[PDB]
RNA sequence: ACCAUAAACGAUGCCGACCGGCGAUGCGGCGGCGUUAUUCCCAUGACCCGCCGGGCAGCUUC
RNA sequence: UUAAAGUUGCUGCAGUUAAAAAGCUCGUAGUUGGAUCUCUCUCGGCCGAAGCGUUUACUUUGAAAAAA
């Protein structure tokens, strides 16, 4: 059955960005997914999206600017201390010049560079570059 | 006619309660109007020049206003100038309980008294004679959202001119950007 | 494909899909308004009705249920509501 | 034809399209060609939208006019029903015709004297001329083609939706493309009808 | 897909978006509740009442008219069954198989279907025992199976 | 691309596909660069300008280069609406 | 009555999402010119043109 | 004995034909599980003492952690 609904959405906009498509429909929406997509959009990787209100759960139609190379989830959400952040971005990120790791911290969902700036650890959701 | 919780009326409330007891004494709606009461009133500025009145009714008396609302809005607009009147229930929003709260939180808050449920029910009754047949939320490139509300086409010419006051009202008492559309078919 | 507006399909295209695969789902049924020819009463009837509906005045059948959609009797004029 | 009153399809062009049968497609429908169909009628034959045949033709004409040396456009038909229209497109335009069998290695084998280096490729049928299509994916060569309803659109870049099975339709499409490329250049004016009758391009078999 | 069957199928209801009652419907909440009350006294299950109210009354959803469910109305009034209607129909099916099976002892493909039915009863009984609908010692047994229906 | 002093330290900046923003590589021999001519809006004759579209080889092997050229030219007003 | 074992073979765990086309077939449902049979008429059956949903398969593809 | 060994694989392997997927279904533990909800009271000097706020996990801090 469908567990880890964010792993569905990140696989859908990975597989559609490879096919050169302009829009993806991901369903069901969630508030974790919307905060993940907002982090990607504010660094230029996706572009605007529209949440479609069914009364059951959402659907999101994401626009795709072809800048995304890879969008991934990390399952399970391991606890990441702030001293452990360098090993995670050594394993996951392709360069020290670009790419992001998305953490859920207690100050919100944010990328790994902002979490250092707020001096916070948390749990890892995924990564994009 | 104006029965607040803090128990002090004001100038618009007096001028609206008088206009409502006028309908209690001349029009044929006395059987409905003698049972009801309002709770607050405001006048906000929309569109740079247009004005709008926000009647506040109690939520147990909400559906009784909605049987007679279309015969109320034009007749109130005749007594005033061109000023679109809007009826909105008076709903509490109990705050989200945290790890640092008070012991007035003894029983769990009902889901109707949440912020999402109140903002999505305020959106239901201010557009009253039409229905909401669909919502889209557009998240723009600066992180800001913009709600699009598709209204019913069967009451299009009734409230087509009101949609620039509706958005200003919902920006006033909620704080959100809303556009109102009319789809050709569902 | 590969540039298809998923937000705004055409209204003859959402009508074609399965009722849960639409952008917002919606049923294929409706409430008809069946008139009995040898009577005056007007009855509300579900279009995909199960067990057979009797007009209580004339005590006659209005629609025998079928697999998909209720089959009316011969001579019952009906209109679809809203 | 960017909503310009100079370039709209006139009455006589529609009459020639209807007389030749360039609106009637085939029986099957490719999923890439679905954008140009009005509807499938009875007797299973798809009708091609002539407003979209006219605008894809006007888009191809701009792609041919945008090449300075006019001999760098090549025009290819490997079946006999379009071999005469290719040879008269190149006499009116100035392109380089290739009729009959396309030699595998014309565009890639640089040792031979058969080696050519065009800048644009116009093709009468993407199914019959499959070999000059695949060789254009080796030498960075854009490709116009006359596509029926069952045509595959791998490596075509401007897909003119006409009928290309009947002998009148092919000749009419090549004639009208020649007239459009000559009208868009400095030569013949858009006022008077063209001197060349469109029956110089038809393939009259024995 | 299905739990005990090896199939998958997309066949279900699909509620509309609009949660309001339609304007043609003239029944209020109280007379609809009166219809539910008079229909529950013929032994009709909650799933059979909503079919009657949909087919011949125009009540598309009782939740949209009354603001409440069918089973909550019959439970607040007191007209509710002792054991729930989807667990009731599973025991009734397990009785009828065991009745047929004691005549026909060679029927292997009712003996196999009995195990699938009876394991679905224990899976459904555990849920109602966690949610405290059944008293937490109620046990389905083959001896006292036939007395419960 | 740029160092901290601001020099451009790169052999060349490669082109990007106008349909799908992919980098057209050095040995991408199926990729296209195509000029579409611009006309004067009262004679319908070739002005001298054009409009350049580049499309990578994977889009052309997909069969999607026809629709991509069409919606790129439709956004520039070269192909009219409908 | 026991025994419970096989090229027990798709030599291929189970559940879930996404990712190309094409024509058939089986079942159910929804529509649609026109043929037949029940003398007409509907209503149905046999065909024909689609659409939807699960199924058994097949062809095809940088 | 460690690296080489991504040939023990958490990072990080494999199971059609190379070693390998249970005859089939049921089913306990285990593992994993769909959306959804935006701080105050008496005293002691406008703040502290008195309560915490459902309870944890998490995260950041502090102090406590022998030397070598």
From Swiss-Prot, chain A:
PTM annotation (N6-succinyllysine): residues: 87
Alphabetical keyword list: Cytoplasm, Diamond-Blackfan anemia, Nucleus, Ribonucleoprotein, Ribosomal protein
GO molecular function: RNA binding; structural constituent of ribosome
A single cellular component GO annotation: nucleoplasm
InterPro entries according to UniProt: Ribosomal_uS8, Ribosomal_uS8_CS, Ribosomal_uS8_sf
HAMAP family from the UniProt entry: Ribosomal_uS8_A (MF_01302_A)
Disease: Diamond-Blackfan anemia 20: A form of Diamond-Blackfan anemia, a congenital non-regenerative hypoplastic anemia that usually presents early in infancy. Diamond-Blackfan anemia is characterized by a moderate to severe macrocytic anemia, erythroblastopenia, and an increased risk of malignancy. 30 to 40% of Diamond-Blackfan anemia patients present with short stature and congenital anomalies, the most frequent being craniofacial (Pierre-Robin syndrome and cleft palate), thumb and urogenital anomalies. DBA20 inheritance is autosomal dominant.
Family, as annotated: Belongs to the universal ribosomal protein uS8 family.
Protein name per the record: Small ribosomal subunit protein uS8
From Swiss-Prot, chain B:
Coiled coil: none
Modified residues (N6-acetyllysine): 67
GO-annotated molecular function: mRNA 3'-UTR binding; mRNA 5'-UTR binding; protein kinase binding; RNA binding; structural constituent of ribosome; ubiquitin ligase inhibitor activity
PTM note: Phosphorylated by NEK6.
A Pfam family the protein falls into: Ribosomal_S7e
GO biological process assignments: cytoplasmic translation; negative regulation of ubiquitin protein ligase activity; negative regulation of ubiquitin-dependent protein catabolic process; neural crest cell differentiation; neural tube closure; positive regulation of gene expression; positive regulation of intrinsic apoptotic signaling pathway by p53 class mediator; protein stabilization
Keywords annotated in UniProt: Acetylation, Cytoplasm, Cytoskeleton, Diamond-Blackfan anemia, Isopeptide bond, Nucleus, Ribonucleoprotein, Ribosomal protein, Ubl conjugation
Chain positions of cross-link Glycyl lysine isopeptide (Lys-Gly) (interchain with G-Cter in SUMO2): 63, 67
Source superkingdom: Eukaryota
Disease with which this protein is associated in UniProt: Diamond-Blackfan anemia 8: A form of Diamond-Blackfan anemia, a congenital non-regenerative hypoplastic anemia that usually presents early in infancy. Diamond-Blackfan anemia is characterized by a moderate to severe macrocytic anemia, erythroblastopenia, and an increased risk of malignancy. 30 to 40% of Diamond-Blackfan anemia patients present with short stature and congenital anomalies, the most frequent being craniofacial (Pierre-Robin syndrome and cleft palate), thumb and urogenital anomalies.
Listed name of the protein: Small ribosomal subunit protein eS7
Gene (name only): RPS7
Swiss-Prot record, chain C:
Subcellular location(s) of the protein: Cytoplasm; Nucleus, Nucleolus
GO terms of molecular function: DNA binding; RNA binding; structural constituent of ribosome; zinc ion binding
Listed Basic and acidic residues bias regions: 1-15
Residues that hold Zn(2+) according to the record: 36, 39, 55, 58
Principal subcellular localization: cytoplasm
Gene3D superfamilies the record matches: Zn-binding ribosomal proteins
Chain intervals annotated as zinc finger (C4-type): 36-58
SUPFAM superfamilies named in the record: Zn-binding ribosomal proteins (SSF57829)
Record bears the keyword Ribosomal protein: yes
Cofactor: Zn(2+)
Phosphoserine carried by residues: 10
GO cellular component: cytosol; cytosolic ribosome; cytosolic small ribosomal subunit; GABA-ergic synapse; glutamatergic synapse; nucleolus; nucleoplasm; nucleus
Cofactor binding, note field: Binds 1 zinc ion per subunit.
Disease cited in the entry: Diamond-Blackfan anemia 17: A form of Diamond-Blackfan anemia, a congenital non-regenerative hypoplastic anemia that usually presents early in infancy. Diamond-Blackfan anemia is characterized by a moderate to severe macrocytic anemia, erythroblastopenia, and an increased risk of malignancy. 30 to 40% of Diamond-Blackfan anemia patients present with short stature and congenital anomalies, the most frequent being craniofacial (Pierre-Robin syndrome and cleft palate), thumb and urogenital anomalies.
Assembly and interaction partners: Component of the small ribosomal subunit. Part of the small subunit (SSU) processome, composed of more than 70 proteins and the RNA chaperone small nucleolar RNA (snoRNA) U3.
Protein name: Small ribosomal subunit protein eS27
Swiss-Prot record, chain E:
InterPro entries listed in its UniProt record: Ribosomal_uS15 (IPR000589), Ribosomal_uS15_arc_euk (IPR023029), Ribosomal_uS15_N (IPR012606), uS15_NS1_RNA-bd_sf (IPR009068)
Signal peptide range: none
PROSITE patterns attached to this UniProt entry: RIBOSOMAL_S15
Residues in cross-link Glycyl lysine isopeptide (Lys-Gly) (interchain with G-Cter in ubiquitin): 26
Keyword terms of this UniProt record: Acetylation, Cytoplasm, Isopeptide bond, Nucleus, Phosphoprotein, Ribonucleoprotein, Ribosomal protein, Ubl conjugation
Pfam families: Ribosomal_S13_N (PF08069), Ribosomal_S15 (PF00312)
PTM comment: Ubiquitinated at Lys-26 by RNF14 and RNF25 in response to ribosome collisions (ribosome stalling).
Listed GO biological process terms: cytoplasmic translation; negative regulation of RNA splicing; ribosomal small subunit biogenesis; translation
Residue numbers carrying N6-succinyllysine: 26, 33
Cross-link (Glycyl lysine isopeptide (Lys-Gly) (interchain with G-Cter in SUMO2)): 42
The family this protein is said to belong to: Belongs to the universal ribosomal protein uS15 family.
Function per UniProt: Component of the small ribosomal subunit. The ribosome is a large ribonucleoprotein complex responsible for the synthesis of proteins in the cell. Part of the small subunit (SSU) processome, first precursor of the small eukaryotic ribosomal subunit. During the assembly of the SSU processome in the nucleolus, many ribosome biogenesis factors, an RNA chaperone and ribosomal proteins associate with the nascent pre-rRNA and work in concert to generate RNA folding, modifications, rearrangements and cleavage as well as targeted degradation of pre-ribosomal RNA by the RNA exosome.
Protein name: Small ribosomal subunit protein uS15
Phylogenetic classification of the source organism: Eukaryota, Metazoa, Chordata, Craniata, Vertebrata
């Amino acid at each position: 059955v469908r567990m880890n609904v964010l792993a569905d959405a990140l696989k859908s906009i990975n597989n559609a960005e490879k096919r050169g498509k302009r829009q993806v429909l991901i369903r069901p929406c969630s508030k974790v997914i919307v905060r993940f997509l907002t982090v990607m959009m504010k660094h230029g990787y996706i572009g605007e999206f529209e949440i479609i209100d069914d009364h059951r759960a959402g659907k999101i139609v994401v626009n795709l600017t072809g800048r995304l190379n890879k969008c991934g989830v990390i399952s399970p959400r391991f606890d990441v201390q702030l001293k452990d952040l360098e090993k995670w971005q050594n394993n996951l990120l392709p360069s020290r010049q670009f790419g992001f790791i998305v953490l859920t911290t207690s100050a919100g969902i944010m990328d790994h560079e902002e979490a250092r700036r707020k001096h916070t650890g948390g749990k890892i959701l995924g990564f994009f570059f | 006619i104006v029965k607040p919780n803090g128990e002090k009326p004001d100038e618009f409330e007096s001028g609206i309660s008088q206009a409502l007891l006028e309908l209690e004494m001349n029009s044929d709606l006395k059987a409905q109007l003698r049972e009801l009461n309002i709770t607050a009133a405001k006048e906000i500025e929309v569109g740079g020049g247009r004005k709008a009145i926000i009647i506040f009714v109690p939520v147990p008396q909400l559906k009784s206003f909605q049987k007679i609302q279309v015969r109320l809005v034009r007749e109130l607009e005749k007594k005033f100038s061109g000023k679109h009147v809007v009826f909105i229930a008076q709903r509490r929003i109990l705050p989200k309980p945290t790890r640092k709260s008070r012991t007035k939180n003894k029983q769990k808050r009902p889901r109707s008294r949440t912020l999402t449920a109140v903002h999505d029910a305020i959106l239901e009754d201010l557009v009253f004679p039409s229905e909401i047949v669909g919502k889209r939320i557009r998240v723009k490139l600066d992180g800001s959202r913009l709600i699009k509300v598709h209204l019913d086409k069967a009451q299009q010419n009734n409230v087509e001119h009101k949609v620039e006051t509706f958005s200003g009202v919902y920006k006033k008492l909620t704080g959100k950007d809303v556009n109102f559309e009319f789809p050709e078919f569902q | 494909p590969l540039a298809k507006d998923l937000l705004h399909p055409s209204p003859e295209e959402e009508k074609r899909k399965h009722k849960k695969k639409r952008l917002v789902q919606s049923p294929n049924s409706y409430f008809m308004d069946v008139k009995c020819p040898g009577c005056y009463k007007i009855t509300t009837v579900f279009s995909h009705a199960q067990t057979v509906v009797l007009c209580v005045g004339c005590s006659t059948v209005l629609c025998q249920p079928t697999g998909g959609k209720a089959r009316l009797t011969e001579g019952c004029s009906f209109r679809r509501k809203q | 034809s960017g909503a310009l009153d100079v370039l709209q399809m006139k009455e006589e062009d529609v009459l020639k399209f209807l007389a030749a049968g360039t609106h009637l497609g085939g029986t099957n429908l490719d999923f890439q060609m679905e954008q140009y169909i009005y509807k499938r009628k009875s007797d299973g034959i798809y009708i091609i939208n002539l407003k979209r045949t006219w605008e894809k033709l006007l888009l191809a004409a701009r792609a041919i006019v945008a090449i300075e040396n006019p001999a760098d456009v090549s025009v290819i038909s490997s079946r006999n029903t379009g071999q005469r229209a290719v040879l008269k497109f190149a006499a009116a335009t100035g392109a380089t015709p290739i009729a009959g069998r396309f030699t595998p290695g014309t565009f890639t084998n640089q040792i031979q004297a058969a080696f050519r280096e065009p800048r644009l490729l116009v093709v009468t049928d993407p199914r019959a001329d499959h070999q000059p299509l695949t060789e254009a994916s080796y030498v960075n060569l854009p490709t116009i083609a006359l596509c029926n309803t069952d045509s595959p659109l791998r490596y075509v870049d401007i897909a003119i939706p006409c009928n290309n099975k009947g002998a009148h339709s092919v000749g009419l499409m090549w004639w009208m493309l020649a007239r459009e490329v000559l009208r868009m250049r400095g030569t013949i004016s858009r006022e008077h009808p063209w001197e060349v009758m469109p029956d110089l391009y038809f393939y009259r078999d024995p | 897909g299905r739990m005990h069957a090896p199939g998958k199928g997309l066949s279900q209801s699909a509620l509309p978006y609009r949660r309001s009652v339609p304007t043609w419907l003239k029944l209020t909440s109280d007379d609809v509740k009166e219809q539910i009350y008079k229909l529950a006294k013929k032994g009709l299950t909650p799933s059979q009442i909503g079919v009657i109210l949909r087919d011949s009354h125009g009540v598309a959803q009782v939740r949209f008219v009354t603001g409440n469910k069918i089973l909550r109305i019959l439970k607040s009034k007191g007209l509710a069954p002792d054991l729930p209607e989807d667990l009731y129909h599973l025991i009734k099916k397990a009785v009828a198989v065991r009745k047929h099976l004691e005549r026909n002892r060679k029927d292997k493909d009712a003996k196999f279907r009995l195990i699938l039915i009876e394991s679905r009863i224990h899976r459904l009984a555990r849920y109602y025992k966690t949610k405290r609908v059944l008293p937490p010692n109620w046990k389905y047994e083959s001896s006292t199976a036939s007395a419960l229906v | 691309m740029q160092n901290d002093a601001g020099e451009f330290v790169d052999l060349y900046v490669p082109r990007k596909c106008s349909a799908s923003n992919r980098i057209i590589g050095a040995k991408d021999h199926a990729s296209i660069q195509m000029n579409v001519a611009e006309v004067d809006k009262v004679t319908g004759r070739f002005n001298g300008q054009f409009k350049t579209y580049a499309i990578c080889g994977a889009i052309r092997r997909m069969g999607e280069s026809d629709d991509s050229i069409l919606r790129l030219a439709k956004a520039d007003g070269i192909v009219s609406k409908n």
